[model samples]
Target: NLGSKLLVGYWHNFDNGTGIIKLRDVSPKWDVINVSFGETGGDRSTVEFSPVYGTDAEFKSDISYLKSKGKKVVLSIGGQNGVVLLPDNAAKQRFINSIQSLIDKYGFDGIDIDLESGIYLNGNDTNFKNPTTPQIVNLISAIRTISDHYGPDFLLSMAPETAYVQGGYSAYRSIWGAYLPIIYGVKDKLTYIHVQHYNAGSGIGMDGNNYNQGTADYEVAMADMLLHGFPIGGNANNMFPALRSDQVMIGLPATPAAAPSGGYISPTEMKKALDYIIKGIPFGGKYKLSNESGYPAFRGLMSWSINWDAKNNFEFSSNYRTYFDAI
Candidate 1:
């Protein structure tokens, strides 16, 4: 068994309409909690997360409580307002030391990769099989050191846009499929990588089909690529290896307000996608599943905000908890 499945959500550090409560106050449905972001500084070399809605003592207490209850709280690295780049060895070291500083101060479980820019700023010069960009190389090395420092209990998760992943099927260059090399480099240490299915909204699935966001077709097909493995640049010879199904997850917005650009899928549609992915339910859709038997061991789901879900009466967490528990 791959152990129990999970439902994960990002708890924002900054205030939004949704309540920014204690980590202990977060929905119990979560197996892991992702602190929204560690704001980066020092030419993008330093990363730090001081809760906007919580003080040092208060946040520490809640983090301890969550850990005691077996909930993982990792520091997410970047967001729209954050950018961290390791252009050289010095910057990489600075990045690692600062990350460790946060871990020391807050006793976080691990780290989450969420830098949306910079990673692709240098992507034009590299390929997914082996990325040579200084930023990319240093990041891999730095993150590898951190994972090694913590050993097995250290959680490593990534939230990349669709263009960095599924977009590789269309074009291997630039931002398209850029996460491939870093992901491949750190696959061994990775807990899971949740491709943000909401923002970029669509991609070309391995089935040679165009799938849009906010639909079961997109969820099934995007996840299928990660689960079954797909060729990079659409060439079988340059195949990107499959991550264990458990290492793959679907990322989305918790509500319409959660995803400003409009990628909020309804609960019923979400359930249909999960049923097909995790329970072998036959999908009546355009992109056909290569393995109709389904992926029973597929790990879980992820959403943009725990705060946004709370604003919407926690339906996002509640509905998902019900579905995951029943299975």
Candidate 2:
């Protein structure tokens, strides 16, 4: 079923149009392809997919072909360098209008909110006590309203950095706790919460233990926090709601060089952690929760970028696809 499927991020800008393989070429390996990214333009309300790798017509044709093969192609907005923010109601409306226009123009199945910076206006910070502000609240509301217009089939996913999703880490307690509220606000409409498990120096696991990134232990522990639910420390009311196993996916970097600094696990290690989660084989770490019953119905894996995998002779996709198919 579509509920349990693999997702891969495809950087459209990486295409050179000369000898590069198009997205359709690798559509068979992934169920969903998140096109990266629709960056914030001069006006915060609008977004631009600038310096396009290929012609617009070619990109559109490729997307149409992927759809024809029963794969979903979504537009991912915001990245580490993107500046996406809605300061007021007017900006919110404009943001909505621009996103809707992009969807209509490219026939995107949905939108992936990967806002890594400027979640709040004026560089303001949020905490567990005050998890969100009015602007953010309204912004989430507008997104939901638009998703409603698109109906149940619209796929809305979020790629919040590790600090935002897992807040128990002492370093992220003060300045990086806003994403939890945003996720809570849009959980109903969210298809998957693929929290990037790279670049996160260290974080608190569900078992109240600290773990470093780039290891099977880290992946298992962090994933357990999302599946079992945990408190977003600092305030009594800042608890992350437990999400269904089918709504969470373990996100990782495809190649070691892809995220050299942000903890890149090999395909074998990734499969081990996943097997522990879904089948309880303990191929890697020894971390376990009170509920040892593994999540056999858990949603599948997500990689940082398919372009990197292609450059690496499709090693990441090929290895993950074998495990995904067996599951």
Give the per-residue lDDT of model 1 (tens digit) for 1-327: 123588878988877667666777788877888998888765778777788865897888889988888788889988766688777888889889999889988989898898865667254554565678877778889999999988887889999888888887777776777888889989999999998888665678887878788888988888888888898886888888889988988998999988887678898998989888887786587877757788888889889888888888888899988888887
Q: Which runs in model 1 stand beyond 4 Å of their true positions?
A: 1-3, 121-126
Give the lowest summed-lDDT range of ten residues in model 1.
121-130
Clashing pairs in 1: none
Candidate number achieving the greatest lDDT relative to the actual structure: 1
Clashes of 2: 1
Highest-TM-score candidate: 1
Cα lDDT of candidate 1 equals 0.83
Lowest-sum lDDT 10-residue window in model 2: 120-129
Backbone clash numbers for all candidates listed = 0, 1
> What lDDT tens digits, residue by residue, belong to model 2 across residues 188-262?
888888888987887777666777888888898888877877765544465667788888888888787777787
